[PDB]
Amino acid sequence: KISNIFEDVEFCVMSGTDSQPKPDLENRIAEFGGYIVQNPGPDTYCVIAGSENIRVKNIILSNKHDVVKPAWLLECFKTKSFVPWQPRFMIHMCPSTKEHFAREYDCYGDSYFIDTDLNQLKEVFSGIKNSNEQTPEEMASLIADLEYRYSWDCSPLSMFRRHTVYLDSYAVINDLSTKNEGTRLAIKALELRFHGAKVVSCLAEGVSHVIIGEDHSRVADFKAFRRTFKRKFKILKDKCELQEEN
């Protein structure tokens, strides 16, 4: 009607009780000139879904339709526009819609007509579950390597993470024996958390530079490591601290 877009595309207005009631939605749809039904049909291209219950389970098992959240309909109402289909107001979907989303990226939503922005990326990252499931060391090293391939070492703090830099944390390579409640080994152990430098607790063979931590008493230990290794250990005097490289 006034929308001129609500024509065609049978709408299954039966689940819109999230916070708004049922009738107002279909009254506004009819004002906009939209189709009304409360059951799946051959012309029913989309089915709205508010609260989630056994009918959603049926449409999941009987995959005749999809799940459409009322936010898209509210956006269409307030803007007088046909908002496209993106994976934020989908829960259940048809397989044909699954390869429709395969056009986007795979199923996450990568519109080739509308570029990615802060909102899309931030909210899909918030929505998508955790990927931190395996050992942090190997995954962080892979992140480091792909960063070095693309020169992505741009963290505001650069002392421990993935920035092709390594910081020693032990006086001798042991079970924190030389710490003995009074050296700076515990602080160095606690320092590997949120900075930027390739995550290696000890014995980094991929970095030729040796940096000296806050423990300046390891200079004899550093020289012993230099004698026992093939890496050149040099004493100090991009980290905004006494730890630096010349």
């Binding site: 990252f125 998508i128 931190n132 992140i143 958390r193």
Partner: protein
């Protein structure tokens, strides 16, 4: 003695405070890195593949 006892607890509290907030930082940071690389690795995968079906035409 009393002042060192409190700041030893304060050091342990801030160690707990530093660890608890930061543990959610890398876990989210390494989530974004891993959620993205699968998109990165596979987007260019069809890019180099579909480019091969170009030169046939």
């Amino acid at each position: 003695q009393k002042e060192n006892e409190r700041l030893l607890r304060d050091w342990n509290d801030v160690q707990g405070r530093f660890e608890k907030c930061v543990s959610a930082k890398e876990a989210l940071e390494t989530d974004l890195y891993k959620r993205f690389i699968l998109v990165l690795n596979e987007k260019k995968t069809k890019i180099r593949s579909l480019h091969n079906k170009l030169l046939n035409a």
